[PDB]
Design a protein around this ligand. Structure first.
Ligand SMILES: c1csc(-c2ccc(-c3cc[nH]n3)s2)c1
Lengths: 172, 172
């Protein structure tokens, strides 16, 4: 995946978030620290928060990331699309996990009710672990895919099943 | 707790895999043809066991004493879904699912290669997106989880231009 996509992946709360543009940051609602009143040196006052279940969008009044160009954010992707989940792990290692996306789903995973776009990992047969699959610290990592000449972001990592084979992307 | 990924090591014109502190496997064709040492050990002290595109090195001292010994097998049962553990010089880690087939001699871009055939499971096009193999990936290991045990069953020898078909070189 291109360097300009990896540059947008930002350590945040208990997981990650993604810069769509200089003013727009997206993340998984449950990774956001509950007491937080400041983000990138700005007060809540100065920020427009748009929350839909496990999807949260932050729109800043000023350019926090002026090095970046605005990208396309879509509301999930067609069934059958292959996405990469842009996961950073211990070492500056970069793990673009391949996932075949499916239908919008409602699930119970461990102790929680989760809603978003379901996918199946294409990394291995029994991806329950850090080497081939996701771990709880990956929450907020972006789902991206290439279309013709463009890259698109279409959601953020919200949950995985006990087996690790099924993941859920929260969508706008 | 050393990951599988720490066992994958840049070597020659591709990669290789540490099975144990003293055992290193790779694709025969990536090995330098001019050398007096590997990993700081003189060639006098290294046992080289070659079988077509599969080579095993057995060192007289512990090169990777941080590692436990893993199961090495001569390929796997037909239908096993293995993971090819690809490292790239970007720092990206690309585990790709491959459904394994029969041992054969296959014509791969006008060349005969003997090993275990496999088909990538990342679908349509495996190039333009991190979804398939490229020439510098040779030597990457084929692994799978069986009960509690990780199994390594060979090394990446060849892939078609098309994308779909790969060859895993195997021991004996
Ligand atoms: C039997 C007939 S085709 C086939 C598979 C296709 C895709 C699979 C898969 C599993 C994990 N990642 N991709 S399994 C098995």
């Amino acid at each position: 995946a291109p360097p300009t996509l990896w540059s947008r992946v930002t350590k945040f709360g208990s997981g990650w978030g993604f810069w769509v543009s200089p003013t727009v940051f997206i993340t998984t609602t449950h990774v956001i620290p509950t007491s937080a009143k400041e983000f990138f040196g700005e007060p809540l006052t100065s920020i427009a928060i748009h929350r839909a279940g496990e999807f949260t969008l932050f729109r800043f009044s000023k350019k926090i990331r002026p090095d970046l160009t605005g990208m396309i954010l879509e509301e999930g992707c067609p069934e059958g699309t292959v996405c990469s989940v842009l996961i950073k792990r211990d070492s500056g290692e970069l793990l673009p996990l391949a996932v075949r996306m499916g239908a919008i789903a409602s699930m119970r995973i461990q102790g929680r009710l989760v809603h978003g776009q379901s996918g199946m990992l294409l990394t291995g047969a029994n991806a329950k672990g850090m080497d081939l699959g996701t771990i709880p610290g990956d929450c907020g990592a972006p789902y991206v895919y290439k279309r013709a000449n463009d890259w698109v972001v279409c959601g953020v990592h919200a949950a995985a099943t006990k087996s690790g084979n099924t993941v859920v992307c929260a969508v706008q």
